[PDB]
Amino acid sequence: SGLVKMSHPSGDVEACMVQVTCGSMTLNGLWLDNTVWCPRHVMCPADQLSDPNYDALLISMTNHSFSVQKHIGAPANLRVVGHAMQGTLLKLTVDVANPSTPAYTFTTVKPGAAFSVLACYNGRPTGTFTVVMRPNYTIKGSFLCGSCGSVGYTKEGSVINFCYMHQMELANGTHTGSAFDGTMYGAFMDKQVHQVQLTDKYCSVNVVAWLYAAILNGCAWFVKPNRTSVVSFNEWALANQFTEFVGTQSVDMLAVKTGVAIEQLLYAIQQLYTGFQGKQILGSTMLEDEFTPEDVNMQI
Amino acid sequence: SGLVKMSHPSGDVEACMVQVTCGSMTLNGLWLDNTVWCPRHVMCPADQLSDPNYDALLISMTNHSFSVQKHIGAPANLRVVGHAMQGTLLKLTVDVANPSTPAYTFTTVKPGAAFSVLACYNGRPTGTFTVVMRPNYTIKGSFLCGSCGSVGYTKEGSVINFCYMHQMELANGTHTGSAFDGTMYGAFMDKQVHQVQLTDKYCSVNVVAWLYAAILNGCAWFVKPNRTSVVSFNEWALANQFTEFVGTQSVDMLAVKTGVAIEQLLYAIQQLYTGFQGKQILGSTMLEDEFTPEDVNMQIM
């Protein structure tokens, strides 16, 4: 028992990190087979960090303009042999195939899904943490300058699902990247400028999962016969900043084991939104939406 | 910025996890050079949890009483050729050396310092998460049955500092283990007898760090002119389940960049124990002490 946030073991992903460097601009690269993905703002100097014609920067660039170096080991130097643009990413093709390429896939996440991040600086992994993809389409992480390109992923069996490559910071402590198809999550642009983000809804399903976890592992008190039909709750959610609760088998499993119905909870969450009191429940003091239903079962 | 919880990369340590088995008892061991470390309760059957004298159990063991499999690329089977017991750990010696043995040390961590745990199950890594060693010498982590043998570590530069091996759950949803000198964390004994506590205290130096990070993210209001000497505080700390703020760590540095005096926070913490206003500080209305000064530095240096 006990409920902490966990990232996946990073060994397999760590072996794919490299440092892409375009002149004086330098960031992080993902190396799989003999392709190196990295963010496209690496080819942007400083003066034009504003309104850059990327298609012009793309044709401007030539293979000799780039460099990439594996610091992990054994290194080291790979020859950039071909380049293309794929949305906000830049798809570098390289001399050698990564002998440590895992069984991998490229998938996008939805709000409320979780993935683990490998935070790298100059192609050197430094830390990992798990994050949830937000409703406004941002993540709350901790990344510093030169962290761009650092990746997010999940593991389905032996296959490592790659879902994120960090791009930039917006707001304070709030971040975005793109998916490996090139699409920035939530439209944002790969250039820092006025692009203020939509408001943050609370992940209602994840809260519900979190509250089931708390019913296990201890208490479990606010649970009363008072309930709120998922349909009346989802109407309330529109006004009060919660997501539209859907629910799943994974959630039913949590209901059945505890013996507490979904609704008895959906009610409760309405009362702790106001009553930020308890005093606490697990964590926390009130409302964690970072813990998915997938997670909560996985930790029993 | 943000301030999330970061375990170190697990790579190096994942390479060193194996499965150990004795009787039909099976747990996670750590393989370094020609040496495999695992909790000593593996060789207990189940009927001896009350008075397992391991002194007895270690003699009755032959090398050929233990199977040890790696499981992770590249597999797998390794052959024991030298057993031993050192405190609550088991020290095995095996026919082959780990070719992916990192640079490492054993170092006993102190309360309030943090480290990354690699959760294992049948010699298989499964999750990592950072955690803090509490005052009461427990860690409030997440394990299940089987994970025993799981290991906690702190990467110092190019070196791994092994500081934990997971041994049991104090039937609480909090956990303790051994260090890699044999010694248990807290003076506990590895047994099914019901065991005591040693209440928690808030890690003062860690709350202070957190409050700085709040200021670094623009959260201040709890700040005032007031102060309260370090020693003043430490006297009060005793009475209210807080640790002696030795702090006095080369940070500071957080005191230097914020221009907010360490003592000022000692006053604010004092009132925030009373309070809150209630405003919130980085999404909380209770003092958070699982973040070290170093975390706050690394995370915004």
Residue numbers in the entry:
A (entry chain B): 1 to 300
B (entry chain A): 1 to 301
What does the paper say about this structure?
Similar to other CoVs, after entering the host cells, the nonstructural polyproteins (pp1a and pp1ab) of MERS-CoV are synthesized and then cleaved by two coronaviral proteases, a main protease (Mpro) (EC 3.4.22.69) and a papain-like protease (EC 3.4.22.46). The MERS-CoV Mpro, namely nsp5 of the pp1a proteins (residue 3248–3553), has been identified. Like other Mpro, there is a catalytic dyad that consists of a His residue and a Cys residue. Sequence alignment suggests that MERS-CoV Mpro, in a similar manner to other known Mpro, has a chymotrypsin-like architecture consisting of a catalytic core (domain I and II) and a helical domain III; sequence identities of CoV Mpro protein range from 50% to 80%.
In the present study we expressed and purified the MERS-CoV Mpro using the authentic N-terminus via an Escherichia coli system. The structure of the MERS-CoV Mpro was determined at 3.0 Å resolution by X-ray crystallography. The crystal packing belonged to space group C2221, with unit-cell parameters a = 87.2, b = 94.0, c = 155.1 Å and α = β = γ = 90°. The final atomic model containing two Mpro molecules in a crystallographic asymmetric unit agrees well with the crystallographic data and the expected values of geometric parameters. The overall dimeric structure of Mpro is similar to that of SARS-CoV Mpro; although a relative shift of 10° to 30° could be observed for the two domain III within the dimer. Indeed, the r.m.s. distance between equivalent Cα atoms of the domain I+II of the two structures is 0.9 Å, while that between the domain III of the two structures is 3.1 Å. Interestingly, the dimerization interface situation with the MERS-CoV Mpro was found to be different to that of SARS-CoV Mpro where there are four amino acid pairs with intermolecular polar interactions (Ser1…Glu166, Arg4…Glu290, Ser123…Arg298 and Ser139…Gln299). There are only two pairs of intermolecular hydrogen bonds, Ser1…Glu169 and Ser142…Gln299 that are associated with the dimer surface of MERS-CoV Mpro according to the current structure. Based on the current structure, residue Val4 showed a hydrophobic contact with another protomer’s residue Gly141. Our results confirmed that there are fewer intermolecular polar interactions at the dimerization interface of MERS-CoV Mpro and this results in the enzyme being in the monomer form in aqueous buffer; this contrasts with SARS-CoV Mpro, which is mostly in the dimer form in similar circumstances due to the greater number of intermolecular interactions.
